[PDB]
A = this chain, B = another copy of it.
Amino acid sequence: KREQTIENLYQLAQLTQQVQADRIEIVLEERRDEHFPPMSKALMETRSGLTRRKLDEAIAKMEEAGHQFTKNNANHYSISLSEAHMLMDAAGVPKFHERKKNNENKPWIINVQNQKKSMTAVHLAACLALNLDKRYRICLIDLDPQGSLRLFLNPQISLAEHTNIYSAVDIMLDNQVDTEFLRKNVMLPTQYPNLKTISAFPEDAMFNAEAWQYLSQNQSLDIVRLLKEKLIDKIASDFDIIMIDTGPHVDPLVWNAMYASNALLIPCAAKRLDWASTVNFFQHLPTVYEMFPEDWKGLEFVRLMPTMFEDDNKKQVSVLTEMNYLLGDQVMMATIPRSRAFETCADTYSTVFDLTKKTLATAQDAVQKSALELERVLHSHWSSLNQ
């Protein structure tokens, strides 16, 4: 019955290909729109690299203008994220971008690749976005259609007053598209004044279909140029960093992400399972690239991190120091632990920077030093990349 079943299939293809899917409605039906825990002026000091005197002066200037700061039950300052950014601009420090010896840069395009909880790229975006001396313009793009990565960091929906919401692949396969268009309709603001977001929707699955059947008509290899030529290039003006999050699969989606991407970052854990998948990955991961039209700009760096670490199991060391001595540098000294706190983030769709003893500090100190450590490398290669 080969024929008859196809016929029922299109019958359901076109019967159902008219039912439903109000997207603004469900993003709106998810707004967990809560915001950030205000800083202490000790914490604002740490995150800013401002002296209490330069900071207090910045306050006083903002207060001698209209501004009124909220205050404690102990009448202690409670500075918001917005307040902290403006405090910077009041202290007369200019954004990372601003310091002009780096203002002709090209933007980092880090392609994170979760090999199995796909929530480390979001901690990076928040820690890098949560460094107020620099105040990077970042962008965290979700590319896994099975991604909750806009449940974390829910965009300011900013209302039903939003036409439509597009994902990356909605701008690859589309719907005239310009950076004015992408700002107004596909990149959304998120609770971190300087971290914007680009969500994905399980519909984004279509892509692969059209890819794997858009090669029948071609052993071509112009299908990996779509996200660069259609979207990333059209938003590299406004951004210092870009992170494209893909999780585990082979794909023309993650393919479409590697070609536009000029560095790789591979979160993994002590586990031999994710470890083992990953070396299969690498073994499969040269042709992987060889394939896109030679105009591919190579990679700058590529590195991996240890995620979810037990530094009490003699057993997990017995894979991470295989990693250490297997790979030395090109791994990260920052072993993020397991942490009750990290995992109620996965429960509650927050990041450790959203909540108010016994993980908090080492949860965030873990991420913050892994983001500091991440941070060195990017500066190391920004020169070469910039070429």
| Interface, chain A (partner B; CB < 8 A) | 1-6, 8-10, 12-14, 16-17, 19-21, 26, 115-116, 145-146, 201-203, 205-206, 208-209, 212-213, 215-217, 219, 248-252, 272-277, 279-291, 294-300, 302, 322, 326
Contacts and interface: CB of A to CB of B under 8 A. Distances in A.
Contact of A9 (B2, B9, B285): B285
Contacts of A212: 212, 215, 250, 252
A97 B19 CA distance: 42
Q: Which of A115, A116, A250, A280 has the most CB of B within 10 A?
A: A250
Contact of A285 (B13, B116, B273): B13
Nearest to A315: B29
Given A2-B296, A286-B9, A297-B2, A19 B206 contact: no
Contacts of A3: 298
A280 B206 contact: yes
A20 B279 contact: yes
Contact of A216 (B19, B205, B219, B285): B219
Given A249-B249, A279-B17, A6 B290 contact: yes
B4 A277 contact: no
Contact of A280 (B8, B10, B203): B203
Contact of A250 (B2, B12, B201, B205): B205
A235 to B, nearest CB: 23
B248 A282 contact: no
Given A202-B274, A203-B276, A284 B209 contact: yes
Contacts of A217: 219
